[PDB]
Design a protein around this motif. Structure first.
Motif, mmCIF file in Angstrom:
data_model
loop_
_atom_site.group_PDB
_atom_site.id
_atom_site.type_symbol
_atom_site.label_atom_id
_atom_site.label_comp_id
_atom_site.label_asym_id
_atom_site.label_seq_id
_atom_site.Cartn_x
_atom_site.Cartn_y
_atom_site.Cartn_z
ATOM 1 N N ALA A 145 3.817 7.878 6.769
ATOM 2 C CA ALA A 145 2.713 6.925 6.754
ATOM 3 C C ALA A 145 2.393 6.532 8.192
ATOM 4 O O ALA A 145 3.208 5.882 8.856
ATOM 5 N N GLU A 146 1.242 6.982 8.687
ATOM 6 C CA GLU A 146 0.718 6.588 10.005
ATOM 7 C C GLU A 146 -0.761 6.330 9.814
ATOM 8 O O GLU A 146 -1.322 6.718 8.785
ATOM 9 N N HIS A 147 -1.381 5.666 10.790
ATOM 10 C CA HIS A 147 -2.842 5.624 10.900
ATOM 11 C C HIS A 147 -3.220 6.799 11.780
ATOM 12 O O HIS A 147 -2.802 6.855 12.928
ATOM 13 N N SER A 191 -3.014 11.823 1.389
ATOM 14 C CA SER A 191 -3.659 10.693 0.706
ATOM 15 C C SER A 191 -4.000 9.575 1.679
ATOM 16 O O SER A 191 -3.273 9.353 2.646
ATOM 17 N N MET A 192 -5.098 8.873 1.401
ATOM 18 C CA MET A 192 -5.555 7.738 2.207
ATOM 19 C C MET A 192 -5.457 6.426 1.414
ATOM 20 O O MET A 192 -5.990 6.322 0.304
ATOM 21 N N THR A 193 -4.787 5.428 1.989
ATOM 22 C CA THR A 193 -4.735 4.098 1.388
ATOM 23 C C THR A 193 -6.067 3.383 1.694
ATOM 24 O O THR A 193 -6.753 3.763 2.653
ATOM 25 N N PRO A 194 -6.450 2.365 0.880
ATOM 26 C CA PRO A 194 -7.661 1.584 1.187
ATOM 27 C C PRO A 194 -7.669 0.973 2.598
ATOM 28 O O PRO A 194 -8.693 1.027 3.284
ATOM 29 N N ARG A 195 -6.521 0.436 3.018
ATOM 30 C CA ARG A 195 -6.336 -0.161 4.356
ATOM 31 C C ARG A 195 -6.196 0.822 5.551
ATOM 32 O O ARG A 195 -5.741 0.418 6.627
ATOM 33 N N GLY A 196 -6.559 2.097 5.370
ATOM 34 C CA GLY A 196 -6.698 3.045 6.491
ATOM 35 C C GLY A 196 -5.501 3.932 6.811
ATOM 36 O O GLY A 196 -5.647 4.928 7.520
ATOM 37 N N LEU A 197 -4.314 3.546 6.346
ATOM 38 C CA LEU A 197 -3.103 4.385 6.420
ATOM 39 C C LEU A 197 -3.314 5.746 5.747
ATOM 40 O O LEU A 197 -3.937 5.823 4.689
ATOM 41 N N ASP A 204 0.795 -1.235 0.000
ATOM 42 C CA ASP A 204 0.000 0.000 0.000
ATOM 43 C C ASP A 204 0.832 1.293 0.000
ATOM 44 O O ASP A 204 0.418 2.301 -0.586
ATOM 45 N N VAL A 205 1.999 1.245 0.643
ATOM 46 C CA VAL A 205 2.923 2.387 0.708
ATOM 47 C C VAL A 205 3.529 2.668 -0.670
ATOM 48 O O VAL A 205 3.414 3.781 -1.190
ATOM 49 N N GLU A 252 -0.952 8.001 19.298
ATOM 50 C CA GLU A 252 -1.561 8.079 17.961
ATOM 51 C C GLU A 252 -2.023 9.510 17.735
ATOM 52 O O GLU A 252 -2.586 10.144 18.639
ATOM 53 N N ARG A 253 -1.799 10.019 16.527
ATOM 54 C CA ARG A 253 -1.911 11.458 16.278
ATOM 55 C C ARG A 253 -2.949 11.821 15.229
ATOM 56 O O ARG A 253 -3.242 11.025 14.336
ATOM 57 N N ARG A 254 -3.536 13.007 15.393
ATOM 58 C CA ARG A 254 -4.387 13.607 14.378
ATOM 59 C C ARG A 254 -3.500 14.211 13.290
ATOM 60 O O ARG A 254 -2.317 14.455 13.532
ATOM 61 N N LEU A 255 -4.067 14.437 12.101
ATOM 62 C CA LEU A 255 -3.378 15.170 11.016
ATOM 63 C C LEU A 255 -2.719 16.442 11.550
ATOM 64 O O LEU A 255 -1.548 16.676 11.298
#
Lengths: 341, 339
Positions: free
Chosen positions: A273-275, A325-331, A160-161, A304-307
């Motif tokens: 890349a973080e969730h 950008s958002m990956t399908p898997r939530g990253l 995904d990355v 865990e952090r906000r934007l």
């Protein structure tokens, strides 16, 4: 809500026997012991090093929750859940719930949550004598088990990355805090022109070098030891941070980002890349991320952090947040360029 | 359409943060602080002992799980679930989740489960320095809180027990280990002719005396401090045992049953009321008992038992199962005649 419905829900929320029943059973390897089929407890007990009665009662709880079958009274077998907890299983959850391993060991801090609420800081030191980072390095059996588990979460997301970032204007990528380089390797072999560098600890980079450093991607890949808090290895025009910042409190997260912005230079990039946590409600897996946050608060000093929390740390290292950008898997994947034009 | 995702189920079962977020927040009185409406974290933080950032993050989790609302960032309000966590509430859960109280305090043992599997015995002593009864007795305030907690539970169940046994044949009942006497109080007042004796610890029965010893039923009760491992007061014709045997290992539970046989004599009666485990199990009844049974393994050296495990025990105390009924809410009532 109302009364009886709230009651039933609270009773789910308040259960601590199950998650520890589960953790213990995984540590004793009952999932492996029943993979090929039903056993009675006498055999499971005798094989696990556990008192028959004690184990029976534990397995009965866990059967009532659907982790094992109990077809006949004292005999227990595998289910879909138990299969995920086997050592065999490709995407196994054993290393996250094995108490002899490092990750599940930190979960004992749950009982000191009140102290964590008083002081703010983690309570891994309170539980085991040392903070989390010290007694990992103090016993490298755990230190190598940690890398093994982090290697597994890398694998999960690596594709995904590489897909979600543009690499057109990149020459040399640096997986800062990339572990055994699972994500780096995936990017380099997917983009053959690119060069790469893996940065991590002394043993962990050599173990990454071992697993693929003579392969066709590994040829184009520096394997460099040393802490990301020190000045980074040179000649990078893009630094890559995948699930690294949530391990660190704001001061230490700022340091790493500063080191990344220093090392990539004016016209370069820092790729994060973080969730990311959302402003209330969120979507699916906001409950899990807030659960994770609490592990990160209690065990590590991290968060865990906000934007926008990410934007503040980026800013304080003279970087801006570009494309989000958002990956399908939530990253969430964010390109950090130099703050000023 | 179908709850079939095994991975989700496992993630549900493995959560250890939610239950301690819950226990902490109830310990800190947050559900109470938000009964009157929304509060923002800074206030909640100040009023409790807590760091604002840590408390925000803990409430954020519990809000995700529906305990509190969070309608704007960093502010949390009450819900139907928070009501049940208020001290306020008639059926409150506070006394079961307040870490200041001994019940939720005992839940800290969970993290020493591997030792509980090695030894078989409890791990309260390894958590806290002393086993559960010793430091409950060594700290009277815990003792009282325990008593208070059990009293609330006994209060709810007491009408079933009065209505559940036939008291026609009975002149003098002794509630053995009956706490502050909530069941005996109800049993006596339902049957105006009966005499009664509450047997528990000295401070416990004294608390019972102060609570209802003045009432008409209280006047027919001898409030009697002491240990049910010692010889019981002589000449009660029925001994009551309401959720006492599950607290005790096989050997200790036997000693209580014999002590009950002694004090009622031959053709006396021993009335037991437990929630018994049912081989072949089921949904929410069955799972809850199995959860509770682990608490009993880790905090006390106790067990939830079957009808026949209880027959084994009664048989070895010179007692035989005379009649087995179920209350209309699942509590199995068993009369034992002294064989």
């Amino acid at each position: 809500m109302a009364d009886d419905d709230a009651f039933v829900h609270l009773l789910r929320l308040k259960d601590t026997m199950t998650p520890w029943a589960l953790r213990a059973v995984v540590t004793l390897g009952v999932p492996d012991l029943v993979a090929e089929g039903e056993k009675d407890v006498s055999e499971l007990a005798q094989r696990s090093g556990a008192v028959p009665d004690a184990l029976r009662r534990v397995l009965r709880l866990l059967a009532r929750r659907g982790v094992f079958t109990e077809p006949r009274p004292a005999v227990f077998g595998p289910t879909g859940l138990s299969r995920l907890l086997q050592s065999d299983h490709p995407r196994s959850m054993r290393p996250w719930l094995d108490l002899e391993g490092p990750v599940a060991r930190g979960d004992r801090t749950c009982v000191h949550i009140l102290e964590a609420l008083r002081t703010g800081g983690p309570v891994h030191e309170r539980t085991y004598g040392r903070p989390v980072w010290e007694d990992l390095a103090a016993r490298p059996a755990l230190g190598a088990a940690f890398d093994a588990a982090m290697a597994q979460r890398a694998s999960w997301i690596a594709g995904d990355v590489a897909a979600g970032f543009d690499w057109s204007a990149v020459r040399h990528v640096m997986d800062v805090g990339g572990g055994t380089g699972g994500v780096l390797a995936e990017v380099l072999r997917a983009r053959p022109g690119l060069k790469g560098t893996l940065l991590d600890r002394a043993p962990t980079v050599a173990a990454g070098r071992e697993a693929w450093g003579a392969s066709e991607a590994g040829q184009r890949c520096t394997f460099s030891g040393g802490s990301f808090f020190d000045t980074l290895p040179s000649g990078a025009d893009a630094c890559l941070l995948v699930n690294v910042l949530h391990d660190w409190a704001d001061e230490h997260a700022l340091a790493v980002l500063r080191r990344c912005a220093e090392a990539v230079g004016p016209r370069g990039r820092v790729l994060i890349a973080e969730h990311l946590v959302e402003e209330g409600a969120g979507g699916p897996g906001a409950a899990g991320l807030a659960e994770l946050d609490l592990v990160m608060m209690l065990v590590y000093g991290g968060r865990e952090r906000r934007l926008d929390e990410l934007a503040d740390l980026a800013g304080k290292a003279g970087l801006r947040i570009g494309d989000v950008s958002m990956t399908p898997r939530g990253l969430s994947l964010v390109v950090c360029e130099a703050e000023t034009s």
